[PDB]
Design a protein around this ligand. Structure first.
Ligand SMILES: [Mg+2]
Ligand SMILES: [Mg+2]
Ligand SMILES: [Mg+2]
Ligand SMILES: [Mg+2]
Ligand SMILES: [Mg+2]
Ligand SMILES: [Mg+2]
Ligand SMILES: [Mg+2]
Ligand SMILES: [Mg+2]
Ligand SMILES: [Mg+2]
Ligand SMILES: [Mg+2]
Ligand SMILES: [Mg+2]
Ligand SMILES: [Mg+2]
Ligand SMILES: [Mg+2]
Ligand SMILES: [Mg+2]
Ligand SMILES: [Mg+2]
Ligand SMILES: [Mg+2]
Ligand SMILES: [Mg+2]
Ligand SMILES: [Mg+2]
Ligand SMILES: [Mg+2]
Ligand SMILES: [Mg+2]
Ligand SMILES: [Mg+2]
Ligand SMILES: [Mg+2]
Ligand SMILES: [Mg+2]
Ligand SMILES: [Mg+2]
Ligand SMILES: [Mg+2]
Ligand SMILES: [Mg+2]
Ligand SMILES: [Mg+2]
Ligand SMILES: [Mg+2]
Ligand SMILES: [Mg+2]
Ligand SMILES: [Mg+2]
Ligand SMILES: [Mg+2]
Ligand SMILES: [Mg+2]
Ligand SMILES: [Mg+2]
Ligand SMILES: [Mg+2]
Ligand SMILES: [Mg+2]
Ligand SMILES: [Mg+2]
Ligand SMILES: [Mg+2]
Ligand SMILES: [Mg+2]
Ligand SMILES: [Mg+2]
Ligand SMILES: [Mg+2]
Ligand SMILES: [Mg+2]
Ligand SMILES: [Mg+2]
Ligand SMILES: [Mg+2]
Ligand SMILES: [Mg+2]
Ligand SMILES: [Mg+2]
Ligand SMILES: [Mg+2]
Ligand SMILES: [Mg+2]
Ligand SMILES: [Mg+2]
Ligand SMILES: [Mg+2]
Ligand SMILES: [Mg+2]
Ligand SMILES: [Mg+2]
Ligand SMILES: [Mg+2]
Ligand SMILES: [Mg+2]
Ligand SMILES: [Mg+2]
Ligand SMILES: [Mg+2]
Ligand SMILES: [Mg+2]
Ligand SMILES: [Mg+2]
Ligand SMILES: [Mg+2]
Ligand SMILES: [Mg+2]
Ligand SMILES: [Mg+2]
Ligand SMILES: [Mg+2]
Ligand SMILES: [Mg+2]
Ligand SMILES: [Mg+2]
Ligand SMILES: [Mg+2]
Ligand SMILES: [Mg+2]
Ligand SMILES: [Mg+2]
Ligand SMILES: [Mg+2]
Ligand SMILES: [Mg+2]
Ligand SMILES: [Mg+2]
Ligand SMILES: [Mg+2]
Ligand SMILES: [Mg+2]
Lengths: 182, 185, 58, 159, 172
RNA sequence: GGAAUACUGCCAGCUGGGACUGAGGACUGCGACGUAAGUCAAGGAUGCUGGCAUAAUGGUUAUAUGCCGCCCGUCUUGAAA
RNA sequence: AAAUAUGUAAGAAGUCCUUGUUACUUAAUUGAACGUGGACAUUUGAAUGAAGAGCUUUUAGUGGGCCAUUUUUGGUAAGCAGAACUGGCGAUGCGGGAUGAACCGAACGUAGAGUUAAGGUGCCGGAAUACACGCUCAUCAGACACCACAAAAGGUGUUAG
RNA sequence: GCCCUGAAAAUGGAUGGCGCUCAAGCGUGUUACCUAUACUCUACCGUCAGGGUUGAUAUGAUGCCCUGACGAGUAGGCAGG
RNA sequence: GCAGUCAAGCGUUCAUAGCGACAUUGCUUUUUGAUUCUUCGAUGUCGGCUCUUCCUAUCAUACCGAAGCAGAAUUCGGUAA
RNA sequence: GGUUGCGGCCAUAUCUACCAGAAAGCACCGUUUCCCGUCCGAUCAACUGUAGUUAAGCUGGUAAGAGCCUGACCGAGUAGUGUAGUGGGUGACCAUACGCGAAACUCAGGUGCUGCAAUCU
C-alpha cells in the first residue's frame, strides 16, 4: 500500500509483482472437447464441471492456461477466498482416498515432513506459494464447487470475460465468482 | 459427468484366494492370511500369495534344483521352501541333508530327501518353526518350460514352434521354410 | 454399387485406446547388424577381461 | 495408376539449398562418430549412395554402428499403435551431430563443477532448471519520462 | 460495456540491454472495468506502436473521475467506426453531466442509428465544448436558449393493479 | 482548506424469516467453557405436548384432472414410416 | 517465406579419476568397445499429472458407415461425388432449437434440498405487459445461430453522418 | 441505418400459435426472474479399491466391519442369479 | 421457360412510344439433364374420354394509365383468375 | 604487417573499371641434352635461376559502381495464420477476444575472417 503512496509522492509509479498464484475453475462440460486442451484439463485435475484447483504461475504452466482457456475461468485468489475454500471444501488425498480436513492431525500426518502441520500451514504454503507448493497443493483434492448462487452475471458463459463474460483470466474478479460457487 | 482417465469398476488382475476347493489348502491359506496379516516378514506375504496360484504357475521344483540351490554360499543350513510339489531327480548322486518344506513330495522325492538324513515337512509345520521365514530359501520352478509356450508368439521370423499335430518331413517343411521352396519363414 | 474408398477417420482414436507407449530400452541391447569383425575381436576382449578377473578368485 | 516410388514426393526435400550446390565441403568428412552418439538426419541429394528414405528426413536417432563410410542409426518409427525400432545405414553426408545433445553434456560438466564449488563450501546448490518466473515489483521513474499519451487514429484512404 | 468508467492506463515496453528505462505511454480508456481497460490499451498499442504485451508491461491503472459531475456540459465526440461496407469518421455532440455519461449514450446511439456494436467503434476524442455556440449540431443547440421551457404532453401513468375503476387521464 | 458519501474489498462482527434433512446406536477422538465441582452446540436429534380407533395412516385398483408417451420385430448411415 | 502441425534431448543404463582385457585399430600403451578399483546419493539435474507400473495368453463382434466446423478435388450445381484433422451420430437417453439422427447445453444407479447451463419470462407456458437510449409504419412491415433463401439496380420516406 | 420498389405457382395455413405498432419489431445497455437425468450437500442400491477382524470367548472367515471413489450403452464378452 | 439492370444502336429526326446489341443480376420447376434419398415379400407404366379444383407469367370480358393515341384498328403498361 | 605451401568456413571473398605495390616470395620469363606429352616444347615433361620484367597473374586502394552480407518502431503489427462465440452480413466476405506473425518496399552500415608451417626491411 505505502509503496504505491511513496512512489506517487516521488512522482514515480510503484508497479506490483506479477501474481505468483492462480485458482482455476472448469466451467465447461466434458463432451465435445478437443484432444489437446482435453489432456491439459486433466493434468490440471479439472475433469468435471465446476471443479477447481490452484496453479503456480510460471511460463510452463502459463501456456497450459492458454491452451485450456475457453473452458475455464480463473484469476487471483484472495486470502479470504483461499481460507474459506480450504476450510469449507478442503479435502486431502491419502491412499488414493478423498478425506476431509476435519482435524489438523490429518495434515501433519501427511504434510508434516514438509513443515505444514495445520490447515493454516496449508493455506500459507498456498497463498505464499514457494517451497512445497507442489506437494501441499497436490495433497488438496480438486475443489468440488457448486454452480454460482446468484448466476454467472452474463447472458452467455462461453465468450471471454472481456467479450461479455466467463472463461479466460478474469483476474481479481475470480474471487466474487468462487465465493458464490463456494 | 466425469472425463474419466481410467476404466471404472476395474478389478485387479490378481487372484485373491486359491481356485481350488481342497479343504486342506483353504486351511493353509487360512493360516498364512493370518501370518501375513499379523506379521511383517515379507516371506509370509509371499507364500500366502503363492498359495493362490494355478498348476502352471506352480511348476515343480526338482530335487536337484534344491541340491544346487544349497551350494549357494551361506545356504547349506537354510530350509528350502517350495509352495508347490517337489519331484525326484535320478541324476544327482550326492544329495545333502537339509529340511524341505513343500506342499507335496513325490514318492522318490521324500525318499531321496529323507535317506540323506534330511526332513520333509508340510507348510504349516514350517509355519510353527519359522513364523517369519527364518532361514527359509524359497524356490520356484522353470515356468517357461511348458510344451505350451513353445508356440506362443508363433510368427514369420519369430523362431517359434508351429502348432503341428504330427511332425516329420512332409509336415510344414517346404514352401516358406527354405529359400528353395518359395522363401524362408 | 460403388462404396467408400478410404479414410483414416477414427484410426487415431483406435491407436490411443491402449497405445503408443514406446519400445522398451535395455542396457546390453541387440547387436543385430553391428560390424562383424568388430564383434569377433570383441568376443576376445571379453574372454580376456573375465579370464583376467579370475586372477582374483582362485 | 497411382505412383508410390521410393523417392516420390521429394522434389524439394532432396533439393540442394539455393546457391549451395556442388561439392560437399570437407567438414562433413572430418567429423567423427561414436556409438551412442545422437545424430540428426538430413539427406544430401547429391550423395545418392547411403541416403535415408524420405520418411527419416528430419528425424533424430542414436548411432548403433560405425562402419567404413557410414553410421548405423537407430530410429524409433511409429507404425500402427506401437513404436517399432529401425536400423538405418546412412553415409556421413546425411548425418549431423545434434546440438541440443552437445549442450546437454556442457550442462553436465557445468553441473559437476557448480556442485564442486558448492560442496567445497558445504553450501547448497539448486542444479536443476526452473522455468520463467512471474516478475518482482519495480518502480519506474518519471524523470525524463513524462508519459507521452496516445490516442486512436481516424480512418483515411490513400489510393 | 456496462456502466462505463474512464481509466488512465499507463504502460511501457519491457526494459532491456540497450534501453534501461524506456518511454512511458498513456491512454484514456472508456471501459467498464480494469481487465477490459488494460486489454484495450494493448489493443491500440499494437496498432500505433508495434508493441505486443508479451514484451511490455502496464505501469499504472488509475480511474479518472469526473471533475464537476453535477455541472451540465456539452461534449464534442469524435468517432471512427466500422460499417457493413466501409469504415468512417464521425463527429457528434452529446449534452450531459459527465464524460462517462456522454460515452454511454454515444455507444447506444452508434448502435441504434448505425447498428455499430462496441467492437466496431474506436473513440477518437471526447472533449468539453468551452465556448457555447461552438456547439455545431442542432439537436443540442436547441437546449441552449435563454429561459428554455417545454411541456411533456400525453402522460401515461403506469398502473399497479390490472383493473381500474376510472377511465385514466393523460394530463401533465 | 477540512469533511462526508458513493464504489470496491475484508471481519475467525452481531442478528431475524423460510425450506429440506436427522444417516449412526454403550464408551473410546479433537476440543470448547469453567478457579474447581462440573458443563457444552465438541466423532450424525433430542425434549415437551397433542391427535387416531367400525379411525389417522398406508398398499392396490378404478376413474377424473395437469403435463408427458407414434408399432413392435428387423435389415439399415437413417423406420412411427 | 509464416501460423498450425512434426523429430530428438533434459543423466544412476549418469559423471569424473585410476588402469585391465582384445586376434579389432593406430607410427605408437594409439584408439575403439567392454570392465576392475576409487569418488559424487539434500534440487540425481525443467513443468504438470499419475486414479499404480510392467507383461503374457486367448477369444467375440466389425470389416456398407454417416454428420458438423475448418482444409480441400471433380461438377453449373445438388439433401451430388471424393480426400484431410478433430468432434459427433451410429450404439444415447436428458434440457434447449415448436417439429427433427448429427446443432446448442449436457451424457444417465433409486431419491431429497439447493444452484445452474443452453434457452426463455404478453397469453398459450414455469418466469419483469421490467428498467433505459434510439430506430422503424410497410394497401407485401418485422420478429434470432445451424434453418428452412434472395440479387444486380433504384426511392425528394425517415434517421444519423 | 430502418423502411419502400426490384419480389411470379399451383388443397386453405402458418415469426410454433394467438396476436403485437413510444412492440410482444430492430440495435444496445442494466437488473431481476423461470428451468435439465449437469453442479453442490445428504440418504439408499450396486460396482471397484484400500484396510480392520475368529487369542479363549452360542447362530453366517467364501463371513462381520471401517473408509474412498465410481454408475450411458448396440454388436459383443464375462459374472451372479 | 420467364423477368430484370446498363444503354451502343433501331426507331426521317429522336437511346428508352415501341424495341434493344456487347455484357451482367435473377426467377421458375409443365423441358431436358445431373443425382440415386424413398419404394424391387410389387405405389398398375403413354394418349384420350369424364369431372372437380387450384396457379397466374391474362388470350377474352370490366375499369384505367401510355403511344411515333387524328378517326378506325392496334400496341405498351396497372387493378384484375 | 607483407609473402608462400596446405587449408576451414565458402561472394563482407564474386563482377566491372581505374590507380598503386617497398622487401622477400610468387610469378612472368631463359633453354630442349636427358625422362616425358603435343598438329604445335602453347599446354604437359625435363634443364638453368642463368639473359630479362612487375607488363600481366597476384596484392591492396578507388567507385552517390553491379552483386553479396548485416540491421532498423522503413513498410507492418500489414498479409497470412492457431483458438472463441446462438458475433456482423442476403452473400462474397468482415470485425472483436486469447495468441503467432511474413514478404515486396524504404533507409542505414559493411565488402573476407581465420588455422598450421616456412619466410621477409
Ligand atoms: Mg441475491
Ligand atoms: Mg435465486
Ligand atoms: Mg456485467
Ligand atoms: Mg453455495
Ligand atoms: Mg523339452
Ligand atoms: Mg532367426
Ligand atoms: Mg460393388
Ligand atoms: Mg454412394
Ligand atoms: Mg469399405
Ligand atoms: Mg500420382
Ligand atoms: Mg516430387
Ligand atoms: Mg532452409
Ligand atoms: Mg548405384
Ligand atoms: Mg468493413
Ligand atoms: Mg474497429
Ligand atoms: Mg461478515
Ligand atoms: Mg437413528
Ligand atoms: Mg385410503
Ligand atoms: Mg404429446
Ligand atoms: Mg409390440
Ligand atoms: Mg436403404
Ligand atoms: Mg422399427
Ligand atoms: Mg507429440
Ligand atoms: Mg480378437
Ligand atoms: Mg478377429
Ligand atoms: Mg476378421
Ligand atoms: Mg478443426
Ligand atoms: Mg460437432
Ligand atoms: Mg448398424
Ligand atoms: Mg447424446
Ligand atoms: Mg426452428
Ligand atoms: Mg461450441
Ligand atoms: Mg439468451
Ligand atoms: Mg395456443
Ligand atoms: Mg406465467
Ligand atoms: Mg400510409
Ligand atoms: Mg450468420
Ligand atoms: Mg435513404
Ligand atoms: Mg409479377
Ligand atoms: Mg416471414
Ligand atoms: Mg436484418
Ligand atoms: Mg431489445
Ligand atoms: Mg449482444
Ligand atoms: Mg437487451
Ligand atoms: Mg438424481
Ligand atoms: Mg451399465
Ligand atoms: Mg423520341
Ligand atoms: Mg439514332
Ligand atoms: Mg418494335
Ligand atoms: Mg430414383
Ligand atoms: Mg412394397
Ligand atoms: Mg394405389
Ligand atoms: Mg393390376
Ligand atoms: Mg397479376
Ligand atoms: Mg390504371
Ligand atoms: Mg413523336
Ligand atoms: Mg392514327
Ligand atoms: Mg378500320
Ligand atoms: Mg391496325
Ligand atoms: Mg416489356
Ligand atoms: Mg375461379
Ligand atoms: Mg627435345
Ligand atoms: Mg616454354
Ligand atoms: Mg612444366
Ligand atoms: Mg598466385
Ligand atoms: Mg554497391
Ligand atoms: Mg484483411
Ligand atoms: Mg484467423
Ligand atoms: Mg451457444
Ligand atoms: Mg441468415
Ligand atoms: Mg481477415
Amino acid at each position: 500500500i505505502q509503496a504505491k503512496r511513496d512512489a506517487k509522492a516521488a512522482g514515480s509509479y510503484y508497479v506490483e509483482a506479477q501474481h505468483k498464484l492462480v485458482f482455476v475453475v472448469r466451467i465447461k462440460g466434458i463432451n465435445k472437447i478437443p484432444p489437446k486442451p482435453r489432456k491439459v484439463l486433466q493434468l490440471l485435475r479439472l475433469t468435471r464441471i465446476n471443479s477447481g484447483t490452484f496453479v503456480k504461475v510460471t511460463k510452463a504452466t502459463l501456456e497450459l492456461l492458454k491452451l485450456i482457456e475457453p473452458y475455464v475461468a480463473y484469476g487471483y485468489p484472495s486470502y479470504s477466498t483461499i481460507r474459506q475454500l480450504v476450510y469449507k471444501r478442503g479435502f486431502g488425498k491419502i491412499n488414493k482416498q478423498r478425506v476431509p480436513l476435519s482435524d489438523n492431525a490429518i495434515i501433519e500426518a501427511n504434510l508434516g515432513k514438509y513443515g505444514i502441520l495445520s490447515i493454516d500451514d496449508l493455506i500459507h504454503e498456498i497463498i505464499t506459494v514457494g517451497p512445497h507448493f507442489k506437494q501441499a497443493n497436490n495433497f488438496l483434492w480438486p475443489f468440488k464447487l457448486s454452480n454460482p448462487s446468484g448466476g454467472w452475471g452474463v447472458p452467455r458463459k462461453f465468450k471471454h470475460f472481456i467479450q461479455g463474460g466467463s472463461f479466460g483470466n478474469r483476474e481479481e474478479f475470480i474471487n466474487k465468482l468462487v465465493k458464490s460457487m463456494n | 459427468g466425469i472425463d474419466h482417465t481410467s476404466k471404472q469398476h476395474k478389478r485387479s488382475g490378481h487372484r485373491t484366494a486359491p481356485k481350488s476347493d481342497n479343504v486342506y489348502l483353504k486351511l493353509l491359506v487360512k493360516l498364512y492370511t493370518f501370518l501375513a496379516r499379523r506379521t511383517d516378514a515379507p516371506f509370509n506375504k509371499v507364500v500366502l500369495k503363492a498359495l493362490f496360484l494355478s498348476k502352471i504357475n506352480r511348476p515343480p521344483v526338482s530335487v536337484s534344483r534344491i541340491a544346487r540351490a544349497l551350494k549357494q554360499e551361506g545356504a547349506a543350513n537354510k530350509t528350502v521352501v517350495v509352495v508347490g510339489t517337489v519331484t525326484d531327480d535320478a541324476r544327482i548322486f550326492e544329495f545333502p541333508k537339509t529340511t524341505v518344506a513343500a506342499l507335496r513330495f513325490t514318492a522318490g522325492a521324500r525318499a531321496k530327501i529323507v535317506k540323506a538324513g534330511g526332513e520333509c515337512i508340510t507348510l504349516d509345520q514350517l509355519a510353527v518353526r519359522a513364523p517369519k521365514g527364518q532361514n527359509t530359501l524359497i524356490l520356484r520352478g522353470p515356468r517357461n518350460s511348458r510344451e505350451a509356450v513353445r508356440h506362443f508368439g508363433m510368427g514369420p521370423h519369430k523362431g517359434k514352434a508351429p502348432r503341428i499335430l504330427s511332425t516329420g518331413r512332409k509336415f510344414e517343411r517346404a514352401r516358406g521354410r527354405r529359400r528353395s521352396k518359395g522363401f524362408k519363414v | 454399387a460403388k462404396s467408400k474408398n478410404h479414410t483414416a477417420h477414427n484410426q487415431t482414436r483406435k491407436a490411443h485406446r491402449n497405445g503408443i507407449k514406446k519400445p522398451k530400452t535395455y542396457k546390453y541391447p541387440s547387436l543385430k547388424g553391428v560390424d562383424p569383425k568388430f564383434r569377433r575381436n570383441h568376443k576376445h576382449a571379453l574372454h580376456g577381461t573375465a579370464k583376467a578377473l579370475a586372477a582374483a578368485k582362485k | 495408376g497411382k505412383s508410390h516410388g521410393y523417392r516420390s514426393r521429394t522434389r524439394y526435400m532432396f533439393q540442394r539449398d539455393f546457391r549451395k550446390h556442388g561439392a560437399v565441403h570437407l567438414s562433413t568428412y572430418l567429423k567423427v562418430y561414436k556409438v551412442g552418439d545422437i545424430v540428426d538426419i538430413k539427406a544430401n541429394g547429391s550423395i545418392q549412395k547411403g541416403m535415408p528414405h524420405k520418411f527419416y528426413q528430419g528425424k533424430t536417432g542414436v548411432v548403433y554402428n560405425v562402419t567404413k563410410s557410414s553410421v548405423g542409426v537407430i530410429i524409433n518409427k511409429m507404425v500402427g499403435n506401437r513404436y517399432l525400432e529401425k536400423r538405418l545405414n546412412l553415409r556421413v553426408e546425411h548425418i549431423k551431430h545434434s546440438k541440443c545433445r552437445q549442450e546437454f553434456l556442457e550442462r553436465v560438466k557445468a553441473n559437476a563443477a557448480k556442485r564442486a564449488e558448492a560442496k567445497a563450501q558445504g553450501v547448497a546448490v539448486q542444479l536443476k532448471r526452473q522455468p520463467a518466473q512471474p516478475r518482482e515489483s519495480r518502480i519506474v521513474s518519471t524523470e525524463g519520462n513524462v508519459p507521452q499519451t496516445l490516442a486512436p487514429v481516424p480512418y483515411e484512404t490513400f489510393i | 460495456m456496462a456502466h462505463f468508467k474512464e481509466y488512465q492506463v499507463i504502460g511501457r515496453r519491457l526494459p532491456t540491454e540497450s534501453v534501461p528505462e524506456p518511454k512511458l505511454f498513456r491512454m484514456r480508456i472508456f471501459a467498464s472495468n480494469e481487465v477490459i481497460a488494460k486489454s484495450r490499451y494493448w489493443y491500440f498499442l499494437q496498432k500505433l506502436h508495434k508493441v505486443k504485451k508479451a514484451s511490455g508491461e502496464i505501469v499504472s491503472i488509475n480511474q479518472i473521475n469526473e471533475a464537476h459531475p453535477t455541472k451540465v456540459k456539452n461534449f464534442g465526440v469524435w468517432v471512427r467506426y466500422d460499417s457493413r461496407s466501409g469504415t468512417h469518421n464521425m463527429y457528434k455532440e452529446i449534452r450531459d453531466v459527465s464524460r462517462v455519461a456522454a460515452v454511454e449514450t454515444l455507444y447506444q446511439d452508434m448502435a441504434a442509428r448505425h447498428r455499430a456494436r462496441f467492437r466496431s467503434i474506436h473513440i477518437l476524442k471526447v472533449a468539453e465544448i468551452e465556448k457555447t455556440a461552438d456547439v455545431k449540431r442542432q439537436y443540442v443547440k436547441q437546449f441552449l436558449t435563454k429561459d428554455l421551457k417545454f411541456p411533456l404532453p400525453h402522460r401515461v401513468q403506469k398502473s399497479t393493479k390490472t383493473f381500474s375503476y376510472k377511465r385514466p387521464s393523460t394530463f401533465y
